[PDB]
Amino acid sequence: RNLRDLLAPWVPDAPSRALREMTLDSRVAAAGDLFVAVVGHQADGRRYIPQAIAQGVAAIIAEAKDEATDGEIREMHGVPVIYLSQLNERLSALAGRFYHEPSDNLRLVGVTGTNGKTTTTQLLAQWSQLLGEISAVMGTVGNGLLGKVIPGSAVDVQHELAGLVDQGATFCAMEVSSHGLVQHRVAALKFAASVFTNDMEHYEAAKWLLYSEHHCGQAIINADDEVGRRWLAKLPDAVAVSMEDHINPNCHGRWLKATEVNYHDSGATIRFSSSWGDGEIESHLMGAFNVSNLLLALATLLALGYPLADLLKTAARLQPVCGRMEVFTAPGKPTVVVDYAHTPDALEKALQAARLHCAGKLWCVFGCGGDRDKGKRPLMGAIAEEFADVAVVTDDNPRTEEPRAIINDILAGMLDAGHAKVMEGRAEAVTCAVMQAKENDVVLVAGKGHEDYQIVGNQRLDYSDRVTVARLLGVIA
């Protein structure tokens, strides 16, 4: 890494100078580093140029705004200081060149949207890897190769992506936040594909301008979303994806539509037609939204050139995100779903998702955390009463608060608290549901998802919903 090579596209006559790491933070700036001095939230990194110099940085690139001309080369204590105009906008491209253009050395798929980003990213990484990629995710859970995910600026994005290139990643599914796109955090990334999951004039105008600046590659758009359709009208090469009959086939563009979905006790049977051919997928995922997420990942990988027959042969091995509508079924036992839903909206969505798969009674086993906001307790009670047939109210991380007090606040939210079943011991309430429910019933166990712990008092006790359920059903969590 060399200041002269680094700046070649922008500053012809930049001093030659070996560089170690690139950092925006004056405090961790070490001997040989490149320090980047940026202006942002009431924060001027140009203040910290003396400190960085004192710490032995090889060179500095700074905002030119009010200080200097674009490409102005100065020299402070023998340290090259180079000024660039609009450094915030150029930070992605600068870090990209520093880290050897990692998005040009793997297939990067970007996923944007309010919901389903995590599941769609996770499904793209899994499906690509089933077809022989070494696949990685960057998102909210964290970053890493699949199954090795470790819990942020334009530089960190490029750095992390370069790190996955070094670990052998050939594919990466990245969640792109609305706030990341506006902040220019992914401005220089070469996306193979951009997936969209789900005052309007400005909003659209803002985003359209940003999108037109990015390398988006293949555009894959949920046509079941109202905004998705308007954007598809403007994008003739974009793939339209639907499970609610919103493919306008007059366009002669690429498309993928679920024709029939059967929601059964262990997943979803998805019949679909596409411009690539027709197929049947056995999904082990639960709910309508996960059908959508799966069809977006399928359309994306078809658009990138993965053969339909290979995607089909491998679809059955796609897994849920741990503790996200995760199904446990055993020969002749009730279906059980572990979901991490711990808010009224999440609890309602998970019960609506679970009802689609339930021929009999829908059981909801849940509780609310102690020494937290009490506002959600009666709202979650009311949702369990409405969208479940049986509400089993139990403990969920009661901490120092009287456990039965939390239950009382949940029951108060209901029209008919006496219809609720109350059972303390979380483990005992889960047992009560699983052991009483019929073979064609569904037991939603909400609140913890992947948490392997029940905080009672100051104690973090070893407890898993997934393990309690797996053991009751006679299966392995």
Q: Answer with the one of 289, 317, 345 that is the final residue of a domain.
A: 317
As a whole number of angstroms, the distance between CA 166 and CA 349 comes to 39
Write out the binding residues for ATP. Answer: 113-119
Based on its alpha-carbon atoms, the radius of gyration of the chain, rounded to whole angstroms, reads 26
As a whole number of angstroms, the distance between CA 374 and CA 391 comes to 19
Q: 435 and 300, same structural domain?
A: no
C-beta of residue 347 within 8 angstroms of C-beta of residue 446: yes
Q: 129 and 68, same structural domain?
A: no
Tokens of residue 124, six digits: 């793209």
Q: 357 and 428, same structural domain?
A: yes
- Determine phi and psi for 472, rounding to 5 degrees: -65, -35
If 0-12 CB within 10 Å is exposed, 13-18 middle and 19+ buried, where does residue 37 land? buried
The angstrom resolution of this structure is 2.1
The contacts of residue 458 (CB under 8 Å, 6+ apart) are: 399, 400
Residue type, 101: E
Write out the binding residues. Answer: 24, 26, 41-43, 113-119, 177, 183, 185, 372, 396-399, 447, 451
As a whole number of angstroms, the distance between CA 354 and CA 370 comes to 26
Q: Name the 3-class secondary structure at 201.
A: helix
Please choose, from the candidates 49, 92, 52, the residue with its C-alpha nearest in 3D space to the C-alpha of residue 67: 49
Q: 159 and 59, same structural domain?
A: no
Alpha helices in 286-360 (DSSP H): 288-303, 308-314, 344-355
The contacts of residue 179 (CB under 8 Å, 6+ apart) are: none
Tokens of residue 12, six digits: 């012809």
Tokens of residue 354, six digits: 């679970």
Task: Give 96's Cβ-side CA count (13 Å radius).
Answer: 18
Sign of CA dihedral 136, 138, 139, 142: positive
Token match 């100078």: residue?
17
As a whole number of angstroms, the distance between CA 356 and CA 162 comes to 42
Tokens of residue 304, six digits: 């990138």
C-beta of residue 361 within 8 angstroms of C-beta of residue 354: no
Q: Which residues pair with 145 in a beta bridge?
A: 136
The contacts of residue 473 (CB under 8 Å, 6+ apart) are: 328, 329, 330, 333, 336, 434
Q: 306 and 211, same structural domain?
A: yes
Q: 118 and 33, same structural domain?
A: no
Which residues span the domain enclosing 23? 3-96
Please choose, from the candidates 53, 55, 114, 61, the residue with its C-alpha nearest in 3D space to the C-alpha of residue 79: 53
The contacts of residue 434 (CB under 8 Å, 6+ apart) are: 333, 334, 336, 443, 469, 472, 473
As a whole number of angstroms, the distance between CA 376 and CA 297 comes to 34
C-beta of residue 81 within 8 angstroms of C-beta of residue 49: yes
Q: How far is CA 145 from the centre of its chain?
A: 15
As a whole number of angstroms, the distance between CA 47 and CA 83 comes to 14
Q: Answer with the one of 96, 127, 143 that is the final residue of a domain.
A: 96
Compute the CA torsion angle 206, 212, 213, 216 (nearest 10 deg). Answer: 120
The contacts of residue 370 (CB under 8 Å, 6+ apart) are: 397, 398, 399, 400, 401, 403, 406
As a whole number of angstroms, the distance between CA 66 and CA 85 comes to 10
Q: What is the CATH number of the domain that holds 103?
A: 3.40.1190.10
C-beta of residue 241 within 8 angstroms of C-beta of residue 255: yes
Q: 335 and 457, same structural domain?
A: yes
Q: How much of the chain is helix, strand and coil, in % rounded to 5?
A: 35, 25, 40
Tokens of residue 174, six digits: 């990245």
Give how many domains the chain has, as a whole number. 3
Give the relative orientation of helices 288-303 and 344-355 as an angle to the nearest 10 degrees: 80
Q: Which residues of 1-23 are buried (b: 16+ CB within 10 A; e: fewer)?
A: bebbebbeebbeebbebebebbb
As a whole number of angstroms, the distance between CA 369 and CA 36 comes to 43
Q: Answer with the one of 317, 341, 375 that is the final residue of a domain.
A: 317
Q: How far is CA 189 from CA 10, 36, 184, 384, in A?
A: 18, 19, 10, 44
Tokens of residue 260, six digits: 């029939």
DSSP 18: B
Write out the binding residues for meso-2,6-diaminopimelate. Answer: 372, 396-399, 447, 451
DSSP string, 52-118: HHHTT-SEEEEE-TTT--TT-EEEETTEEEEEETTHHHHHHHHHHHHTT-GGGSSEEEEEESSSSHH
Compute the CA torsion angle 9, 192, 248, 225 (nearest 10 deg). Answer: -90
Q: 91 and 126, same structural domain?
A: no
Q: 341 and 241, same structural domain?
A: no
The contacts of residue 373 (CB under 8 Å, 6+ apart) are: none
Q: What is the CATH number of the domain that holds 353?
A: 3.90.190.20
Q: How far is CA 172 from the centre of its chain?
A: 12
DSSP string, 252-276: ---EEEEEEEEEETTEEEEEEEETT
Tokens of residue 93, six digits: 């491209």
As a whole number of angstroms, the distance between CA 80 and CA 11 comes to 13
Task: Give 306's Cβ-side CA count (13 Å radius).
Answer: 23
C-beta of residue 161 within 8 angstroms of C-beta of residue 172: yes
C-beta of residue 392 within 8 angstroms of C-beta of residue 384: no
Q: 269 and 218, same structural domain?
A: yes
C-beta of residue 36 within 8 angstroms of C-beta of residue 87: yes
Please choose, from the candidates 18, 69, 26, 72, the residue with its C-alpha nearest in 3D space to the C-alpha of residue 49: 26
Q: 335 and 258, same structural domain?
A: no
Tokens of residue 219, six digits: 């555009």
Give the length of the chain.
477
Q: 339 and 301, same structural domain?
A: no
